[PDB]
């Protein structure tokens, strides 16, 4: 294969993405959910982990780590502590709204994924951490969980397999940092959402100090279908090491902003015009695209022409797939103001635990505010670049990196705009 991105409906996983069919148990079963769940559970964790591995699935939460290998850290003899699966539904990355649709329109896929993924890990229960703003979405998930409990699909003797499994829903209280896996765990434990240093890794010491795996909603929700249809089916989509289908969010300056499922490695231009109805004002009006949520560096129009949407392709473009949330900016956008607002976002979300982000991100925010008005000198651009490199790789968690990268992207591709603004301000003062 050389071309990707004409996914057929029969190959789509989230078939109620738009909520046009009954999201409840009766509709979910009619669409293939919960089918032969007992057989999957009886195959054993090694078979389930084997399927997840051969599918080439990678983390859909933004970091893209191989799921099969990650989940295998939990396949070990019990040492007396309970084992837990924590499903990350915090969905805080600006531009990203995919996990919201799964939770409210395909909740039973997430619940079944919790049971199947939990079985492979040997977990006794799944804690679903959903952000507190998603109140109606959380209630839908709770309604679905009650339906599954009453049909015996979860709880004692889940699906008749003799495996006891509970699914808990825990709501956040308004913190983007609580999407970070260790901050999420600390939040579940009743503390501030401040990340943990590693080691220990969560698979050894996690929620309540117990072996734990944190998985994104989308990563979990697809696992039952990978088991039913097989890893080879999943691995037949997208490039090698970039397998499967993916939920994309196309927001910003597009004619029809939308969420859609498409194959991995589809061209970015193909995605924006086939599904979102093209760029506002046409493709020639495109200025820049943030390809994977606010934490991934922007790329200009030239790069957008032929870049594919997968982990490897976007890395070579000096960015990343991230959450696959595409934010589109046309030529009428104040690009400096757009990025400054993201830095302001990271300033408001930093937990404040560690020095480079507590002080550095707030510092970068102040510099960006002056850059928007042009009230600076060109020498400060290289200073700002150097400051961002002192944050990246020196913080406890990746929020520090996620604040540096947007700044680096702007300087990389839009330095003359920054310098032009400075000239205007100096000319007028």
């Amino acid at each position: 294969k050389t071309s990707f991105g004409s996914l057929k409906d029969e190959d789509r996983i989230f078939t109620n993405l738009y909520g046009r069919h009954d999201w409840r148990l009766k509709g979910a079963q009619s669409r293939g959910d919960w089918y032969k769940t007992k057989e999957i559970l009886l195959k054993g964790p090694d078979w389930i982990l084997g399927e997840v591995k051969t599918s080439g699935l990678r983390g859909r939460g933004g970091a893209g780590f191989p799921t099969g290998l990650k989940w295998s850290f939990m396949n070990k003899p019990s040492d007396g502590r309970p084992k837990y699966l924590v499903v990350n539904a915090d969905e805080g990355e600006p531009g990203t709204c995919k996990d919201r649709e799964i939770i409210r329109h395909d909740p039973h896929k997430l619940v079944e994924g919790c049971l199947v993924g939990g079985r492979a890990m040997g977990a006794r229960a799944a804690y679903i951490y959903i952000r507190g703003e998603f109140y109606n979405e959380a209630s839908n998930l709770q309604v679905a969980i009650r339906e599954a409990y009453e049909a015996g699909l979860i709880g004692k003797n889940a699906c008749g397999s003799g495996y006891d499994f509970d699914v808990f829903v825990v709501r956040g209280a308004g913190a983007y940092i609580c999407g970070e896996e260790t901050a999420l765990i600390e939040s579940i434990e009743g503390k501030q959402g401040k990340p943990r240093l590693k080691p220990p890794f969560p698979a050894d010491v996690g929620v309540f100090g117990c072996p734990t795996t944190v998985a994104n909603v989308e990563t979990v929700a697809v696992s039952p279908t990978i088991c039913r249809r097989g890893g080879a089916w999943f691995a037949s989509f997208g490039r090698e090491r970039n397998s499967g289908t993916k939920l994309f969010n196309i927001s910003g300056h597009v004619n029809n902003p939308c969420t859609v499922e498409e194959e991995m490695s589809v061209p970015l231009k193909e995605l924006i015009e086939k599904h979102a109805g093209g760029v506002t004002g046409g493709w020639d009006n495109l200025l820049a695209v943030i390809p994977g949520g606010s934490s991934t560096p922007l790329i200009p129009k030239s790069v957008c022409e032929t870049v594919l949407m997968d982990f490897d392709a976007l890395i070579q473009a000096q960015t990343g797939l991230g959450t696959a949330a595409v934010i589109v900016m046309d030529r009428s956008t104040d690009i400096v103001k757009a990025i400054a607002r993201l830095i302001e976002f990271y300033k408001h979300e930093s937990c404040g635990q560690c020095t480079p982000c507590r002080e550095g991100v707030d510092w970068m925010n102040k510099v960006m505010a002056r850059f928007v008005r042009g009230d600076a000198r060109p020498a400060e651009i290289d200073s700002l670049w150097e400051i961002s490199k002192q944050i990246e790789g020196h913080t406890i968690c990746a929020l520090g990196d996620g604040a540096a990268w947007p700044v680096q992207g702007l300087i990389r591709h839009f330095r003359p705009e920054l310098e032009e603004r400075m000239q205007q301000f100096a000319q007028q003062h």
């Binding site: 293939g32 032969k36 805080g92 956040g172 503390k191 910003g252 939308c258 757009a338 976002f345």
Partner: protein, 213 residues
């Protein structure tokens, strides 16, 4: 917003607060979700329940949550001041929360914010003198493809225009509650002007199941 507490007549340790008997039943179910020996895990949900009953959190509410769960009061103050959804001072009946991050900013969230300020006659961060509405800005609310949008209490209102947000305020001001969701014509997150995928009937149980299962 300040992250230190100063006692006042309206908010001090002797300010009256207790959970209703029904809310004590809900607290018991919350605490049972966690392993024995780890009751501090219930601080966030129980603290939020105290806010759902009282509307906001007086220091006496924080002290009660600490007392019930047997955690030091300071550890509850830490949570209350860390998470933005906790209201540590009174808010209006309708807490309007306008997303102004870049995906929403690109689709003209400033016009929504100006429309609300003009209608209510208040600035961002203020409460109306009638104490019906409080207005603030917030970060991404996880509905970027439906920008611009606001959240009022528990409900999202999306795909907004200045006209649309004024009607919602007029309905809340008139005692009614408007329906949540997009106001542009579409139902949720599907592309406008017709679906581009999921146009065929979904397959049934057992479709594409691998052999040997």
């Amino acid at each position: 917003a300040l992250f230190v507490h100063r006692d006042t007549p309206e908010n001090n340790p002797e300010t009256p607060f207790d959970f209703t008997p029904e809310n004590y039943k809900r607290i018991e179910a919350i605490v049972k979700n966690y392993p024995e020996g780890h009751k501090a895990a219930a601080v966030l949900p129980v603290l939020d329940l105290a806010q759902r009953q009282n509307g906001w959190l007086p220091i006496s509410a924080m002290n009660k949550v600490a007392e019930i769960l047997q955690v030091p009061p300071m550890r509850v103050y830490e949570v209350a001041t860390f998470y933005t959804m906790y209201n540590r001072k009174p808010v209006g009946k309708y807490h309007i929360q306008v997303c102004t991050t870049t995906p929403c900013m690109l689709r003209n969230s400033d016009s929504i914010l100006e429309a609300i300020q003009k209608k209510l006659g208040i600035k961002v961060g203020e409460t109306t003198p009638d104490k019906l509405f409080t207005l603030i800005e917030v970060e991404c609310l996880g509905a970027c493809v439906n920008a611009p949008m606001v959240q009022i209490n528990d409900n999202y209102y999306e795909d907004l225009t200045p006209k649309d947000i004024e009607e919602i305020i007029d309905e809340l001001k008139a005692g009614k509650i408007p329906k949540p969701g997009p106001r542009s014509g579409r139902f949720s997150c599907e592309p406008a002007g017709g679906l581009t995928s999921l146009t065929e009937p979904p397959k049934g149980p057992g479709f594409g199941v691998q052999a040997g299962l």
